[PDB]
């Protein structure tokens, strides 16, 4: 439980690290990530995972696949901010830091959304608190970085 | 086989409004948490919390 | 010979020389074992299975004899020759200078263990240094206790004290037995309490010789004696000791060593304590230069009380 | 024809360690320097000071007072003389003066121990009728005192010519020369056979009597120790507290040093340095002092002397604790607590070590002026110097100063020339023998096992048990107590436990971050706040470069681990 | 001799320890060398001495006869009998099968040693929430071995990411067990845990501590030393206290501290190494090793103590089985 923590810290830091880097200038975008990071563990713990995901969806199509989503071929900062939290959250669940480390995801490679429709409760479970704790720890690096 | 003890009473307790036994702030979504057996995931109020209340009350 | 092993269920305690009364002075630090405290405690037994012939109630020395004792995780103190230099642990060899054998500047000592194989390898002349990784040091546990009143379940008035416990693995012996049947005894015996505050070692024993008491160094005059086990005597009487069981007169010789153990301990016959003796202490080397060249022994026992443990030298080569 | 001599006294450290109060410890190094004198008086007397290379005698107070007859302050009090010195006589007085230097501290020790048994029965150290005092001169005490100082002796021919590349490398390091002509070599060479001669000596020693030990060393036969059993022979001696015929002579030793010089340490417990602590038994005296001896001699006259408490210990309220006039003192105590505040129960055990015979000579004498007057004037009153000997330091403190004075002493040091240090804060009531040992391990096993060394290493030993340790460089003392963190943390723990409890899962690249975070989460109108904050973030970004670590987060850790320490409510009230 | 004591414990476990190393105030007993949890000797030794000593003065202990110790004392003691009685009275001794069984009160302690060494409460099985089970009971190799070699005297390999569980853990089809927030893969094992159970049943019975102990099978999940390690670190209990001014009705001043529990469900197991009884002039039913370990198996076998602090706010309490 203490080794997982290193692994989400190690994660939170590179996403918004890539966002502080490709946004240097942009201080909007970097501020609505900052934001939407903020909020969203209210999203989740107010309506579940699975809406949540759906509440982003909705920001950015023909497949819930957060791998096709390209955040920087949107048009203003809200969607920018929204398409980047939600693909670093997905990638999260399903990739980990890759399957060289020793965090590679939970669901697989599957996007969580559609795991979230086939899975157990359990499976459910285990990916909201995962969720919460990443998003904690995004907060953390983006107050500091953002 | 419990020589220790001579007697012993079994205390009901039926909340009528919610109540927050609560283990402090934690970095978290939920900011103010309520007691929790870890191991188990189940609510409990620790006996200190309740020996605190029996003794003001006393 | 017989091989005994003590397997600690726990920690142990060989407390040094100090007072420790409950309500008085009450802090207890633990040394390393002496040879003596595994000889009582084998004694002991002994005393307590009727086999009073072989305990030697009220001597100094039982009828049987204890070679010299090792604690394990099998390793032993750092040779007080082998100074640290940043991150190495550095053998130094003998000098000369105005016709003395001397041991060059190179450095303080800094204590620690090394396993068997480091040390045979030193023994054997061909080591230069060890890493600073593979030199141990002893594990201690500090426990804080109390006594409660009977009834009122708080502390009695002064009644805390304070332990430093050792965290061994495991404590070897070697015993010599002259027909005492010691070896069926102990094999009778899962455990027995060894040093203080009741803790007990598991037994197990095992007829069999150590190799290291079994190596064979060849012939030389530059010979040296490595001391496993504190070793009582003037340095004058054990060098001419060592003269006589060798069959071989001395040009020269030098002691490395550090500060003397200092040994008492506790009479169990006379219920107090045994009068206070000084030792070369563990880890010291004795360089000797004879005047011939001479087999260099794989063990020698020198010194008083050997049958105690005392004195076991490890033999080695030197250039 | 000129002989370079080496002189070196042994045991030290453990001689020093066997020490239950204050007073022992002092004069536990007061006696090792005075034997030193000892011996050098026997070189002084026939080649005068100016041929002893090591140590500068023109500068010590010893030599000053005692072979001077200059009248010496309370500088005399410190111990100066280490327990090596070198010195050049003639060759023909070599052997000579190695039995006079012998003998001259045997007899010393035999007389202290004399004067020390009279002394003891006369004022009640030993309850026992004055026939009995042959008994504890008998020879079984006696060899314990002639035997226990080994005092080793070399010496080596400076006319002498050899093949240096030959003596050199034999020894393990125109062609012939004189030996002075490679003196600096020499000198180390002359160690080494001096070592080589000291393990010749003191393996020498005679076995003791059965009986019941010393309570202070634990090691000696107690006096009496072999004629009674444990509960009477405690009854027979002042504190229930046995005593070898070392820790006698040790206890006597301060009432001698009174009589030959007058003076007396000022600080002579622990405690008297403990509560040194924001001048609280200064503020204490002033308005409550003349109420409490009053209050005190009222339950017992033996508590009071020279209208002083008989033990400073009387200051703390559990001491009267563990029937009416008891209960008067503790109420009268716990109010002024509650006034000026509760008084400080820890002090601070600080040891130092540092890391042609003319230019030797130059170098003796800035050590000289180093440790008898440098080291001196910063500690002055703030506490208790009980030794400084050259690179090396003993010094008892008061928490407030411990830090400061040892920083001050290092940057002292390095303007006459790297010194490594530790310092233990400890519980007045913890075992001196143990507090003594753990200090020097701080220093020896902590501080000097550290990639180049010159580095503090501070422990705090809690009373409850536990045990804190931080290894810094001399540079984190200054950047903390000129910092807006410092301040801020003494205007708390939260911010501590967190970066404590959770740095092992900060990530390996971004603990700048993390700390940044930390920051913002524990340091807070905003304008003040944006302003602290990044102050802060910068000053424990500069404190860091001086802790010592393997990596950032051991360095994060050792830097928390200290601010832990000065923190502690407990141990700073 | 020895007994094997089984600890279980019910209520959450505080066994202070003052010298251990921690951010947390109060900080339970732990072993230096593996850093596990643990009861000291010393502290099992009073519990155990303080039952013993007030069912003897209550007249509850049986040697298959009502042990009446003062009738005992002075046909053992003679004529220092009543002096004797009059001590243990006065608090400064215990009655007289506490002493031969635990030795003499610190008053006369040089007299004789106590028959039995109480060894350390070794951690053996540590509850650690599942996602499927409500909770496992944990452990390692390192545990597994040395318990084996306790037994063996006194008479696995794994991967950070994997555990060897009971079914009841165990994610359907997926080979997955989840300890609180982390996922461990399921290595397919057949003996293990059944070997571990029947090691179980051969020292405590067929009945787990009042329950089967088929059914604790189903729901141990051996993990590797590190993640075992890291469990008993950093899940035991740590549990915020205060102390409220009731004056003003908000927290005293100096009035917050921080206290580690050992969590219920833990078993642990103590060896009790027990040697003949020191005692001089011994009465009968008591002068011999094997008498001592038969009172000893008696009077605790499926007792129930309190171990450590807080026991007025509900602490300490474990079920025993020797
Ligand atoms: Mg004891
Ligand atoms: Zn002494």
Same mark, same amino acid.
């Given at each position: 439980?203490?080794?997982?923590?290193?692994?989400?810290?190690?994660?939170?830091?590179?996403?918004?690290?890539?966002?502080?880097?490709?946004?240097?200038?942009?201080?909007?975008?970097?501020?609505?990530?900052?934001?939407?990071?903020?909020?969203?563990?209210?999203?989740?713990?107010?309506?579940?995972?699975?809406?949540?995901?759906?509440?982003?969806?909705?920001?950015?199509?023909?497949?819930?696949?957060?791998?096709?989503?390209?955040?920087?071929?949107?048009?203003?900062?809200?969607?920018?901010?929204?398409?980047?939290?939600?693909?670093?959250?997905?990638?999260?669940?399903?990739?980990?830091?890759?399957?060289?480390?020793?965090?590679?995801?939970?669901?697989?490679?599957?996007?969580?959304?559609?795991?979230?429709?086939?899975?157990?409760?359990?499976?459910?479970?285990?990916?909201?608190?995962?969720?919460?704790?990443?998003?904690?720890?995004?907060?953390?690096?983006?107050?500091?970085?953002? | 086989?419990?020589?220790?003890?001579?007697?012993?009473?079994?205390?009901?307790?039926?909340?009528?409004?919610?109540?927050?036994?609560?283990?402090?702030?934690?970095?978290?979504?939920?900011?103010?948490?309520?007691?929790?057996?870890?191991?188990?995931?189940?609510?409990?109020?620790?006996?200190?919390?309740?020996?605190?209340?029996?003794?003001?009350?006393? | 010979?017989?091989?005994?092993?003590?397997?600690?269920?726990?920690?142990?305690?060989?407390?040094?020389?100090?007072?420790?009364?409950?309500?008085?002075?009450?802090?207890?630090?633990?040394?390393?074992?002496?040879?003596?405290?595994?000889?009582?405690?084998?004694?002991?037994?002994?005393?307590?299975?009727?086999?009073?012939?072989?305990?030697?109630?009220?001597?100094?020395?039982?009828?049987?004899?204890?070679?010299?004792?090792?604690?394990?995780?099998?390793?032993?103190?750092?040779?007080?020759?082998?100074?640290?230099?940043?991150?190495?642990?550095?053998?130094?060899?003998?000098?000369?200078?105005?016709?003395?054998?001397?041991?060059?500047?190179?450095?303080?000592?800094?204590?620690?263990?090394?396993?068997?194989?480091?040390?045979?390898?030193?023994?054997?002349?061909?080591?230069?240094?060890?890493?600073?990784?593979?030199?141990?040091?002893?594990?201690?546990?500090?426990?804080?206790?109390?006594?409660?009143?009977?009834?009122?379940?708080?502390?009695?008035?002064?009644?805390?004290?304070?332990?430093?416990?050792?965290?061994?693995?495991?404590?070897?012996?070697?015993?010599?037995?002259?027909?005492?049947?010691?070896?069926?005894?102990?094999?009778?015996?899962?455990?027995?309490?060894?040093?203080?505050?009741?803790?007990?070692?598991?037994?197990?024993?095992?007829?069999?010789?150590?190799?290291?008491?079994?190596?064979?160094?060849?012939?030389?005059?530059?010979?040296?004696?490595?001391?496993?086990?504190?070793?009582?005597?003037?340095?004058?009487?054990?060098?001419?000791?060592?003269?006589?069981?060798?069959?071989?007169?001395?040009?020269?010789?030098?002691?490395?060593?550090?500060?003397?153990?200092?040994?008492?301990?506790?009479?169990?016959?006379?219920?107090?304590?045994?009068?206070?003796?000084?030792?070369?202490?563990?880890?010291?080397?004795?360089?000797?230069?004879?005047?011939?060249?001479?087999?260099?022994?794989?063990?020698?026992?020198?010194?008083?009380?050997?049958?105690?443990?005392?004195?076991?030298?490890?033999?080695?080569?030197?250039? | 024809?000129?002989?370079?001599?080496?002189?070196?006294?042994?045991?030290?450290?453990?001689?020093?360690?066997?020490?239950?109060?204050?007073?022992?410890?002092?004069?536990?190094?007061?006696?090792?320097?005075?034997?030193?004198?000892?011996?050098?008086?026997?070189?002084?007397?026939?080649?005068?000071?100016?041929?002893?290379?090591?140590?500068?005698?023109?500068?010590?107070?010893?030599?000053?007072?005692?072979?001077?007859?200059?009248?010496?302050?309370?500088?005399?009090?410190?111990?100066?003389?280490?327990?090596?010195?070198?010195?050049?006589?003639?060759?023909?007085?070599?052997?000579?003066?190695?039995?006079?230097?012998?003998?001259?501290?045997?007899?010393?020790?035999?007389?202290?121990?004399?004067?020390?048994?009279?002394?003891?029965?006369?004022?009640?150290?030993?309850?026992?009728?004055?026939?009995?005092?042959?008994?504890?001169?008998?020879?079984?005490?006696?060899?314990?005192?002639?035997?226990?100082?080994?005092?080793?002796?070399?010496?080596?021919?400076?006319?002498?010519?050899?093949?240096?590349?030959?003596?050199?490398?034999?020894?393990?390091?125109?062609?012939?020369?004189?030996?002075?002509?490679?003196?600096?070599?020499?000198?180390?060479?002359?160690?080494?056979?001096?070592?080589?001669?000291?393990?010749?000596?003191?393996?020498?020693?005679?076995?003791?009597?059965?009986?019941?030990?010393?309570?202070?060393?634990?090691?000696?036969?107690?006096?009496?120790?072999?004629?009674?059993?444990?509960?009477?022979?405690?009854?027979?001696?002042?504190?229930?507290?046995?005593?070898?015929?070392?820790?006698?002579?040790?206890?006597?030793?301060?009432?001698?040093?009174?009589?030959?010089?007058?003076?007396?340490?000022?600080?002579?417990?622990?405690?008297?340095?403990?509560?040194?602590?924001?001048?609280?038994?200064?503020?204490?005296?002033?308005?409550?002092?003349?109420?409490?001896?009053?209050?005190?001699?009222?339950?017992?006259?033996?508590?009071?002397?020279?209208?002083?408490?008989?033990?400073?210990?009387?200051?703390?309220?559990?001491?009267?604790?563990?029937?009416?006039?008891?209960?008067?003192?503790?109420?009268?105590?716990?109010?002024?607590?509650?006034?000026?505040?509760?008084?400080?129960?820890?002090?601070?055990?600080?040891?130092?070590?540092?890391?042609?015979?003319?230019?030797?000579?130059?170098?003796?004498?800035?050590?000289?002026?180093?440790?008898?007057?440098?080291?001196?004037?910063?500690?002055?009153?703030?506490?208790?110097?009980?030794?400084?000997?050259?690179?090396?330091?003993?010094?008892?403190?008061?928490?407030?100063?411990?830090?400061?004075?040892?920083?001050?002493?290092?940057?002292?040091?390095?303007?006459?020339?790297?010194?490594?240090?530790?310092?233990?804060?400890?519980?007045?009531?913890?075992?001196?023998?143990?507090?003594?040992?753990?200090?020097?391990?701080?220093?020896?096993?902590?501080?000097?096992?550290?990639?180049?060394?010159?580095?503090?290493?501070?422990?705090?030993?809690?009373?409850?048990?536990?045990?804190?340790?931080?290894?810094?460089?001399?540079?984190?003392?200054?950047?903390?107590?000129?910092?807006?963190?410092?301040?801020?943390?003494?205007?708390?723990?939260?911010?501590?436990?967190?970066?404590?409890?959770?740095?092992?899962?900060?990530?390996?690249?971004?603990?700048?971050?993390?700390?940044?975070?930390?920051?913002?989460?524990?340091?807070?109108?905003?304008?003040?706040?944006?302003?602290?904050?990044?102050?802060?973030?910068?000053?424990?970004?500069?404190?860091?470069?001086?802790?010592?670590?393997?990596?950032?987060?051991?360095?994060?850790?050792?830097?928390?681990?200290?601010?832990?320490?000065?923190?502690?409510?407990?141990?700073?009230? | 001799?020895?007994?094997?004591?089984?600890?279980?414990?019910?209520?959450?476990?505080?066994?202070?320890?003052?010298?251990?190393?921690?951010?947390?105030?109060?900080?339970?007993?732990?072993?230096?060398?593996?850093?596990?949890?643990?009861?000291?000797?010393?502290?099992?030794?009073?519990?155990?001495?303080?039952?013993?000593?007030?069912?003897?003065?209550?007249?509850?202990?049986?040697?298959?006869?009502?042990?009446?110790?003062?009738?005992?004392?002075?046909?053992?003691?003679?004529?220092?009998?009543?002096?004797?009685?009059?001590?243990?009275?006065?608090?400064?001794?215990?009655?007289?099968?506490?002493?031969?069984?635990?030795?003499?009160?610190?008053?006369?302690?040089?007299?004789?040693?106590?028959?039995?060494?109480?060894?350390?409460?070794?951690?053996?099985?540590?509850?650690?929430?599942?996602?499927?089970?409500?909770?496992?009971?944990?452990?390692?190799?390192?545990?597994?071995?040395?318990?084996?070699?306790?037994?063996?005297?006194?008479?696995?390999?794994?991967?950070?990411?994997?555990?060897?569980?009971?079914?009841?853990?165990?994610?359907?089809?997926?080979? +997955? @067990?989840?300890?609180?927030?982390?996922? %461990?893969?399921?290595?397919? *094992?057949?003996? =293990?845990?059944?070997?571990? !159970?029947? &090691?179980?049943?051969?020292?405590?019975?067929?009945?787990?501590?009042?329950?089967?102990?088929?059914?604790?099978?189903?729901?141990?999940?051996?993990?590797?030393?590190?993640?075992?390690?890291?469990?008993?670190?950093?899940?035991?209990?740590?549990?915020?206290?205060?102390?409220?001014?009731?004056?003003?009705?908000?927290?005293?001043?100096?009035?917050?501290?921080?206290?580690?529990?050992?969590?219920?469900?833990?078993?642990?197991?103590?060896?009790?190494?027990?040697?003949?009884?020191?005692?001089?002039?011994?009465?009968?039913?008591?002068?011999?090793?094997?008498?001592?370990?038969?009172?000893? +198996? @008696?009077?605790?076998?499926?007792?129930? %103590?309190?171990?450590?602090? *807080?026991?007025? =706010?509900?602490?300490?309490? !474990?079920? &025993?089985?020797?």
């Amino acid at each position: 439980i203490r080794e997982i923590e290193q692994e989400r810290a190690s994660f939170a830091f590179k996403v918004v690290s890539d966002i502080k880097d490709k946004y240097s200038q942009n201080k909007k975008v970097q501020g609505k990530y900052s934001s939407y990071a903020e909020k969203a563990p209210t999203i989740i713990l107010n309506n579940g995972l699975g809406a949540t995901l759906a509440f982003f969806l909705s920001k950015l199509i023909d497949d819930v696949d957060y791998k096709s989503i390209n955040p920087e071929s949107f048009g203003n900062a809200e969607n920018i901010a929204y398409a980047f939290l939600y693909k670093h959250l997905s990638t999260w669940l399903a990739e980990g830091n890759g399957k060289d480390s020793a965090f590679s995801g939970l669901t697989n490679g599957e996007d969580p959304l559609k795991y979230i429709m086939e899975k157990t409760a359990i499976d459910v479970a285990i990916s909201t608190e995962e969720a919460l704790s990443i998003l904690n720890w995004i907060k953390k690096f983006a107050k500091a970085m953002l | 086989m419990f020589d220790m003890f001579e007697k012993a009473v079994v205390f009901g307790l039926y909340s009528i409004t919610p109540v927050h036994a609560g283990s402090g702030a934690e970095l978290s979504v939920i900011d103010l948490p309520i007691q929790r057996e870890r191991h188990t995931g189940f609510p409990v109020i620790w006996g200190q919390s309740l020996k605190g209340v029996l003794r003001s009350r006393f | 010979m017989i091989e005994v092993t003590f397997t600690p269920y726990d920690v142990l305690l060989f407390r040094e020389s100090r007072p420790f009364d409950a309500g008085s002075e009450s802090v207890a630090r633990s040394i390393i074992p002496l040879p003596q405290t595994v000889a009582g405690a084998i004694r002991t037994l002994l005393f307590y299975k009727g086999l009073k012939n072989c305990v030697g109630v009220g001597e100094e020395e039982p009828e049987f004899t204890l070679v010299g004792i090792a604690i394990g995780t099998r390793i032993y103190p750092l040779p007080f020759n082998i100074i640290k230099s940043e991150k190495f642990y550095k053998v130094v060899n003998p000098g000369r200078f105005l016709g003395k054998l001397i041991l060059p500047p190179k450095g303080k000592y800094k204590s620690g263990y090394v396993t068997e194989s480091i040390l045979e390898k030193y023994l054997k002349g061909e080591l230069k240094e060890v890493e600073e990784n593979k030199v141990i040091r002893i594990e201690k546990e500090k426990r804080i206790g109390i006594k409660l009143s009977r009834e009122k379940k708080v502390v009695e008035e002064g009644m805390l004290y304070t332990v430093e416990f050792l965290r061994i693995e495991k404590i070897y012996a070697w015993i010599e037995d002259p027909g005492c049947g010691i070896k069926d005894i102990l094999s009778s015996y899962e455990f027995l309490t060894l040093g203080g505050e009741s803790r007990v070692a598991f037994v197990e024993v095992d007829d069999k010789t150590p190799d290291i008491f079994n190596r064979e160094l060849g012939s030389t005059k530059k010979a040296l004696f490595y001391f496993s086990t504190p070793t009582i005597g003037k340095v004058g009487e054990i060098v001419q000791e060592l003269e006589k069981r060798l069959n071989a007169k001395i040009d020269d010789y030098l002691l490395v060593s550090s500060r003397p153990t200092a040994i008492s301990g506790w009479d169990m016959h006379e219920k107090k304590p045994k009068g206070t003796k000084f030792a070369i202490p563990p880890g010291s080397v004795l360089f000797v230069e004879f005047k011939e060249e001479v087999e260099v022994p794989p063990y020698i026992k020198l010194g008083k009380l050997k049958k105690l443990g005392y004195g076991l030298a490890l033999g080695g080569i030197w250039e | 024809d000129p002989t370079l001599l080496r002189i070196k006294i042994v045991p030290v450290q453990p001689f020093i360690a066997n020490s239950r109060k204050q007073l022992d410890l002092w004069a536990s190094s007061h006696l090792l320097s005075m034997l030193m004198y000892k011996a050098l008086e026997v070189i002084v007397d026939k080649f005068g000071p100016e041929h002893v290379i090591y140590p500068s005698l023109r500068d010590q107070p010893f030599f000053l007072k005692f072979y001077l007859g200059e009248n010496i302050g309370d500088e005399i009090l410190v111990a100066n003389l280490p327990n090596k010195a070198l010195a050049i006589v003639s060759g023909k007085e070599a052997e000579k003066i190695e039995e006079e230097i012998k003998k001259r501290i045997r007899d010393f020790l035999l007389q202290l121990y004399r004067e020390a048994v009279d002394w003891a029965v006369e004022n009640g150290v030993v309850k026992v009728d004055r026939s009995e005092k042959d008994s504890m001169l008998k020879e079984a005490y006696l060899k314990i005192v002639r035997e226990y100082f080994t005092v080793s002796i070399t010496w080596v021919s400076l006319s002498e010519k050899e093949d240096i590349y030959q003596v050199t490398e034999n020894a393990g390091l125109s062609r012939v020369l004189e030996r002075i002509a490679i003196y600096p070599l020499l000198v180390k060479i002359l160690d080494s056979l001096g070592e080589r001669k000291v393990t010749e000596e003191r393996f020498e020693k005679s076995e003791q009597l059965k009986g019941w030990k010393c309570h202070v060393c634990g090691e000696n036969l107690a006096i009496f120790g072999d004629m009674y059993d444990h509960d009477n022979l405690k009854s027979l001696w002042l504190d229930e507290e046995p005593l070898c015929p070392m820790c006698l002579i040790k206890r006597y030793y301060p009432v001698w040093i009174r009589s030959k010089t007058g003076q007396k340490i000022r600080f002579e417990s622990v405690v008297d340095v403990a509560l040194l602590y924001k001048n609280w038994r200064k503020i204490f005296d002033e308005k409550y002092g003349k109420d409490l001896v009053s209050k005190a001699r009222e339950v017992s006259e033996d508590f009071v002397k020279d209208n002083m408490l008989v033990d400073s210990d009387l200051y703390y309220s559990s001491t009267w604790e563990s029937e009416e006039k008891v209960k008067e003192v503790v109420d009268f105590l716990n109010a002024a607590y509650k006034e000026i505040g509760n008084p400080p129960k820890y002090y601070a055990i600080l040891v130092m070590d540092g890391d042609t015979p003319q230019v030797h000579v130059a170098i003796s004498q800035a050590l000289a002026n180093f440790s008898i007057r440098e080291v001196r004037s910063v500690v002055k009153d703030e506490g208790l110097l009980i030794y400084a000997g050259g690179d090396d330091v003993l010094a008892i403190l008061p928490v407030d100063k411990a830090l400061e004075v040892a920083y001050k002493i290092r940057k002292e040091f390095g303007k006459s020339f790297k010194l490594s240090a530790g310092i233990l804060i400890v519980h007045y009531k913890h075992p001196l023998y143990d507090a003594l040992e753990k200090a020097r391990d701080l220093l020896n096993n902590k501080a000097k096992n550290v990639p180049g060394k010159d580095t503090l290493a501070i422990g705090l030993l809690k009373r409850s048990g536990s045990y804190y340790i931080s290894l810094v460089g001399w540079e984190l003392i200054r950047v903390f107590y000129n910092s807006e963190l410092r301040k801020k943390l003494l205007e708390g723990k939260r911010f501590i436990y967190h970066v404590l409890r959770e740095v092992d899962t900060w990530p390996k690249v971004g603990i700048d971050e993390m700390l940044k975070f930390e920051v913002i989460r524990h340091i807070r109108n905003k304008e003040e706040t944006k302003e602290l904050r990044e102050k802060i973030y910068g000053e424990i970004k500069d404190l860091l470069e001086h802790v010592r670590g393997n990596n950032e987060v051991e360095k994060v850790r050792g830097l928390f681990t200290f601010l832990k320490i000065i923190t502690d409510a407990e141990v700073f009230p | 001799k020895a007994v094997v004591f089984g600890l279980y414990s019910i209520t959450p476990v505080h066994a202070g320890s003052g010298a251990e190393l921690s951010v947390i105030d109060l900080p339970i007993q732990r072993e230096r060398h593996t850093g596990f949890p643990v009861i000291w000797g010393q502290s099992l030794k009073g519990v155990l001495r303080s039952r013993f000593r007030q069912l003897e003065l209550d007249e509850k202990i049986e040697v298959s006869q009502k042990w009446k110790w003062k009738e005992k004392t002075k046909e053992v003691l003679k004529e220092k009998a009543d002096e004797f009685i009059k001590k243990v009275e006065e608090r400064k001794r215990d009655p007289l099968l506490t002493e031969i069984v635990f030795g003499p009160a610190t008053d006369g302690a040089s007299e004789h040693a106590g028959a039995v060494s109480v060894g350390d409460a070794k951690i053996l099985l540590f509850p650690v929430r599942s996602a499927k089970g409500v909770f496992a009971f944990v452990t390692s190799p390192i545990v597994i071995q040395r318990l084996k070699e306790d037994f063996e005297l006194v008479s696995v390999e794994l991967s950070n990411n994997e555990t060897i569980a009971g079914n009841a853990l165990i994610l359907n089809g997926e080979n +997955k @067990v989840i300890l609180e927030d982390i996922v %461990l893969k399921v290595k397919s *094992d057949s003996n =293990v845990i059944e070997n571990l !159970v029947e &090691v179980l049943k051969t020292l405590f019975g067929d009945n787990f501590f009042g329950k089967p102990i088929e059914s604790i099978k189903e729901r141990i999940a051996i993990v590797s030393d590190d993640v075992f390690k890291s469990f008993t670190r950093f899940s035991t209990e740590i549990v915020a206290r205060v102390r409220i001014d009731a004056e003003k009705g908000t927290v005293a001043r100096g009035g917050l501290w921080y206290e580690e529990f050992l969590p219920s469900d833990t078993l642990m197991y103590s060896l009790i190494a027990v040697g003949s009884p020191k005692k001089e002039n011994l009465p009968k039913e008591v002068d011999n090793t094997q008498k001592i370990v038969n009172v000893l +198996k @008696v009077t605790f076998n499926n007792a129930f %103590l309190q171990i450590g602090g *807080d026991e007025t =706010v509900g602490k300490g309490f !474990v079920k &025993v089985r020797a």
